[PDB]
Amino acid sequence: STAGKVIKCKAAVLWEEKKPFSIEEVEVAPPKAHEVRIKMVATGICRSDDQVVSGTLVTPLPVIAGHEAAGIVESIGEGVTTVRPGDKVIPLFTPQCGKCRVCKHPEGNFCLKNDLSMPRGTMQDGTSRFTCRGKPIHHFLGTSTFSQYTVVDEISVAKIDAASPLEKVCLIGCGFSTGYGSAVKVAKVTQGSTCAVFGLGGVGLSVIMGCKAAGAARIIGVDINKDRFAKAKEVGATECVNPQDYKKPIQEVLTEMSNGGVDFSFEVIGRLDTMVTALSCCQEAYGVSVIVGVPPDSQNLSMNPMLLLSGRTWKGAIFGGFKSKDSVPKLVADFMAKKFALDPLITHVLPFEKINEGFDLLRSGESIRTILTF
Amino acid sequence: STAGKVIKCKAAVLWEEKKPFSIEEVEVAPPKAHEVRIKMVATGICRSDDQVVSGTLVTPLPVIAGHEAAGIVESIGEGVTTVRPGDKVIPLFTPQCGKCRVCKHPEGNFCLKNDLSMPRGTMQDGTSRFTCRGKPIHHFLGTSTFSQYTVVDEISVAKIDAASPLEKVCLIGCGFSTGYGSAVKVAKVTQGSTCAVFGLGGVGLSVIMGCKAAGAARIIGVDINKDRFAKAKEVGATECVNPQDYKKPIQEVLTEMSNGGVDFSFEVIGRLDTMVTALSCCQEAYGVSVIVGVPPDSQNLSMNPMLLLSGRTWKGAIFGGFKSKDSVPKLVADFMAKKFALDPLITHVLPFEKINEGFDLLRSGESIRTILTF
Numbered sequence: 088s089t090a091g092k093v094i095k096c097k098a099a100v101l102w103e104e105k106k107p108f109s110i111e112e113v114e115v116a117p118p119k120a121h122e123v124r125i126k127m128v129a130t131g132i133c134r135s136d137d138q139v140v141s142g143t144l145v146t147p148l149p150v151i152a153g154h155e156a157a158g159i160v161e162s163i164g165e166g167v168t169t170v171r172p173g174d175k176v177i178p179l180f181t182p183q184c185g186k187c188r189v190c191k192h193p194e195g196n197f198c199l200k201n202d203l204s205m206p207r208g209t210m211q212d213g214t215s216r217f218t219c220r221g222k223p224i225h226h227f228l229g230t231s232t233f234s235q236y237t238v239v240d241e242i243s244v245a246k247i248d249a250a251s252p253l254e255k256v257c258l259i260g261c262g263f264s265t266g267y268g269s270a271v272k273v274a275k276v277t278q279g280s281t282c283a284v285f286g287l288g289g290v291g292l293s294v295i296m297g298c299k300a301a302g303a304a305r306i307i308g309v310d311i312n313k314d315r316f317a318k319a320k321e322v323g324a325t326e327c328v329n330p331q332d333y334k335k336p337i338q339e340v341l342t343e344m345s346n347g348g349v350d351f352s353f354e355v356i357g358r359l360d361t362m363v364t365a366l367s368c369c370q371e372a373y374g375v376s377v378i379v380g381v382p383p384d385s386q387n388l389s390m391n392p393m394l395l396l397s398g399r400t401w402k403g404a405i406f407g408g409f410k411s412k413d414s415v416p417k418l419v420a421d422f423m424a425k426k427f428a429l430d431p432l433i434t435h436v437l438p439f440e441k442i443n444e445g446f447d448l449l450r451s452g453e454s455i456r457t458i459l460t461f
Numbered sequence: 462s463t464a465g466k467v468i469k470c471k472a473a474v475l476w477e478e479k480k481p482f483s484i485e486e487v488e489v490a491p492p493k494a495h496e497v498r499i500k501m502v503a504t505g506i507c508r509s510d511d512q513v514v515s516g517t518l519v520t521p522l523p524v525i526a527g528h529e530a531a532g533i534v535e536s537i538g539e540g541v542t543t544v545r546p547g548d549k550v551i552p553l554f555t556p557q558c559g560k561c562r563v564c565k566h567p568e569g570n571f572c573l574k575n576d577l578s579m580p581r582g583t584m585q586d587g588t589s590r591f592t593c594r595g596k597p598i599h600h601f602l603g604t605s606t607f608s609q610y611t612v613v614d615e616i617s618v619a620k621i622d623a624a625s626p627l628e629k630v631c632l633i634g635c636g637f638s639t640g641y642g643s644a645v646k647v648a649k650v651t652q653g654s655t656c657a658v659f660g661l662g663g664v665g666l667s668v669i670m671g672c673k674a675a676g677a678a679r680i681i682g683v684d685i686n687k688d689r690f691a692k693a694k695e696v697g698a699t700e701c702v703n704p705q706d707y708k709k710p711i712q713e714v715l716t717e718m719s720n721g722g723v724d725f726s727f728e729v730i731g732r733l734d735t736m737v738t739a740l741s742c743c744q745e746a747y748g749v750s751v752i753v754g755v756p757p758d759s760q761n762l763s764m765n766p767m768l769l770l771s772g773r774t775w776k777g778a779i780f781g782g783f784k785s786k787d788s789v790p791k792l793v794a795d796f797m798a799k800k801f802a803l804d805p806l807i808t809h810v811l812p813f814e815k816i817n818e819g820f821d822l823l824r825s826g827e828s829i830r831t832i833l834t835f
């Protein structure tokens with residue numbers, strides 16, 4: 088008895104940059120044509136959400152943030168054919184319209200309907216389904232998961248296994264898939280190679296899982312927080328180094344360790360300097376470096392193009408290069424088949440009402456992934 | 462008769478930056494172990510040699526430049542097994558030692574014995590085989606082809622078909638292979654794709670040849686000199702554009718023409734601004750951009766890493782990605798079998814004695830490639 092009606096529910100609203108989320112009542116409009124309204128079951132706290140609070144990732148405010156989640160369909164608008172009420176689903180922060188040139192390309196995944204390149208913070212139709220204190224609130228990446236209910240366009244949701252544990256597979260909505268895919272699909276890590284992963288938070292650990300699954304012989308974790316090394320080795324790092332321990336630049340250390348440069352490097356932090364360092368540490372003639380971290384808004388890096396002329400390949404990707412709607416159900420199935428592990432990424436599980444505390448664990452460095460439960 | 466003795470011959474010596482070459486007598490020492498002394502037959506004037514004169518490409522002076530050439534073995538040092546006196550050969554400015562990690566890698570070609578990354582201007586043993594006015598003269602990229610005779614390490618020379626027309630196949634020693642391989646081996650241009658090529662000199666025309674060979678549907682030539690357009694279309698460009706004709710930046714023009722960005726772009730000029738423009742004009746999610754041009758010494762470019770994070774691939778390569786000693790003889794065999802044409806690249810021919818006039822033709826923009834005959 089909620090279908091077709093406005094739902095009044097709790098959501099975490101970000102009214103302004105550099106302020107705590109405000110947990111309060113919002114109104115969620117019913118889904119229009121080709122839209123899906125979801126009751127949220129679990130959502131992760133991803134560094135990108137903090138970057139929105141920090142102002143380094145720009146998107147229109149006020150906003151309902153959150154993009155890594157899973158829930159259950161409450162209702163569908165007219166014309167929806169891929170999910171039904173009661174289905175378990177994961178919102179897709181990168182859509183898959185299936186009709187654009189990128190969707191049709193065998194390698195591309197950054198669908199042209201995304202709200203990332205030039206964020207509008209609305210539904211595909213340019214409007215919002217959220218109201219709070221009488222004011223319209225923006226959506227974020229077409230997902231907006233920090234709410235007991237959200238509405239998403241059909242191209243931004245995927246149906247998953249009805250038996251999946253939503254408090255774990257929400258990670259397939261961002262963190263896990265991004266890291267894993269950056270290794271196995273974007274870099275295409277090869278058996279017996281040497282990999283270096285800069286940044287050992289939730290996404291970096293997933294890159295390590297991918298490098299191990301691809302059969303890398305050496306996976307060097309790189310982080311300035313040594314507290315992260317233990318878990319990195321658990322999931323597959325063979326060695327870990329802290330740049331702060333050395334008197335010489337880390338790229339020099341890594342080139343020496345790998346007898347001339349690594350086969351694959353990954354920047355999984357979001358800093359301009361580590362992107363160049365990661366590039367440099369890969370072997371100059373055949374090395375490949377993948378940018379995964381989201382850089383600060385509007386800032387350019389500076390680099391010497393001879394680093395590329397010698398033969399290096401540099402690339403970046405969103406969401407591990409996975410075509411989202413095709414891939415997410417498959418990843419959940421693979422998870423149910425024990426093909427990979429999600430527990431090592433989860434360090435804290437908190438009620439949704441503790442979202443601010445969850446963000447504090449992330450900022451302090453205490454957590455890898457905190458999952459919020461509704 | 463000359464075996465084991467010093468040979469006195471004419472060479473084009475560059476005593477100082479920004480000055481004409483001095484054609485005068487030099488002394489060329491006999492080859493030491495694993496060295497090969499070559500009587501030169503033809504050499505091309507490549508933009509890189511002019512960059513040495515300009516000082517934008519740094520290597521120790523005074524020097525005998527020249528690196529795109531063919532000739533006939535005059536004598537071999539002790540232990541040489543891959544060429545013999547009388548064989549036709551092409552010197553390799555990127556060596557192939559066959560032993561280092563890069564030589565052993567299936568994709569790499571920038572052998573660690575190269576004299577390009579940290580140029581010393583000598584033979585592999587750290588010394589010079591050239592004397593002029595009683596002073597030692599530096600080698601260039603282990604080739605030094607602007608001389609009637611040169612001495613090269615065995616790893617920097619390839620034996621070619623004894624019936625090869627040396628005044629045409631010298632281009633396989635640089636210009637043609639670099640461009641053609643940049644398209645077919647490095648970028649891996651696909652059938653039906655859209656390519657954009659920045660710079661329509663000798664190497665850019667070779668990239669067009671490779672794109673056409675690979676089956677590209679559209680090949681867009683980009684150059685500020687419209688006099689280059691006719692020849693570009695002759696070798697396969699479908700359209701040519703001069704950035705100076707437009708009010709908007711050329712990456713916007715190319716993105717418009719290609720309905721969202723090109724599949725493959727190539728920077729074949731050597732400017733920092735065009736490397737970034739070329740990267741930008743490839744499609745944001747799956748585009749590939751290859752840097753072929755040689756940038757000014759020690760200068761960094763500035764770019765926004767979001768260009769990569771969306772999915773673009775950026776890479777560069779030396780000599781078309783070709784393992785040099787393995788590939789050169791195969792490229793010559795293919796030329797002899799009419800698999801590709803070299804004549805369209807050659808616009809002028811002069812005797813070696815007119816090398817300065819040859820450089821004037823390149824600098825004025827009149828020539829594509831001038832071949833010098835000894």
Ligand SMILES: NC(=O)c1ccc[n+]([C@@H]2O[C@H](COP(=O)([O-])OP(=O)(O)OC[C@H]3O[C@@H](n4cnc5c(N)ncnc54)[C@H](O)[C@@H]3O)[C@@H](O)[C@H]2O)c1
Pocket residue numbers: 133134135138261262265285286287288289290291309310311312315330355356357358361378379380381382404405406407455
């Ligand atoms: N490309 C995408 O689709 C995508 C998806 C998810 C996340 N991201 C980006 O990935 C990055 C990683 O996200 P996360 O959730 O793992 O973040 P996180 O904060 O959990 O991990 C960051 C890690 O980097 C380390 N670090 C910080 N500064 C460092 C330095 N100078 N040198 C070495 N290590 C350093 C930190 O100690 C921490 O362990 C963020 O920028 C995030 O926005 C991108």
Ligand SMILES: NC(=O)c1ccc[n+]([C@@H]2O[C@H](COP(=O)([O-])OP(=O)(O)OC[C@H]3O[C@@H](n4cnc5c(N)ncnc54)[C@H](O)[C@@H]3O)[C@@H](O)[C@H]2O)c1
Pocket residue numbers: 396507508509512635636639659660661662663664665683684685686689704729730731732735752753754755756778779780781829
């Ligand atoms: N990677 C390698 O192994 C390798 C090998 C050979 C040459 N190179 C480099 O390749 C580059 C091209 O060599 P080339 O012999 O073809 O040179 P070239 O001078 O014959 O051609 C350069 C072309 O660029 C055009 N151009 C100049 N400025 C431009 C601008 N702003 N926009 C568009 N077009 C512009 C010129 O008009 C000209 O046609 C040089 O930098 C050279 O050193 C690299």
Ligand SMILES: OCc1ccc(F)cc1F
Pocket residue numbers: 133135136144154180203228261381405406770
């Ligand atoms: O973590 C989700 C995410 C991924 C890429 C990006 F550029 C912004 C963003 F929010």
Ligand SMILES: OCc1ccc(F)cc1F
Pocket residue numbers: 396507509510518528554577602635755779780
């Ligand atoms: O044209 C030969 C050549 C190729 C690449 C480079 F970096 C320098 C150089 F001289």
Ligand SMILES: [Zn+2]
Pocket residue numbers: 182183184185186187188189190198199200
């Ligand atoms: Zn699409």
Ligand SMILES: [Zn+2]
Pocket residue numbers: 133134135136154155261262
């Ligand atoms: Zn995320």
Ligand SMILES: [Zn+2]
Pocket residue numbers: 556557558559560561562563564572573574
């Ligand atoms: Zn080698």
Ligand SMILES: [Zn+2]
Pocket residue numbers: 507508509510528529635636
């Ligand atoms: Zn050259």
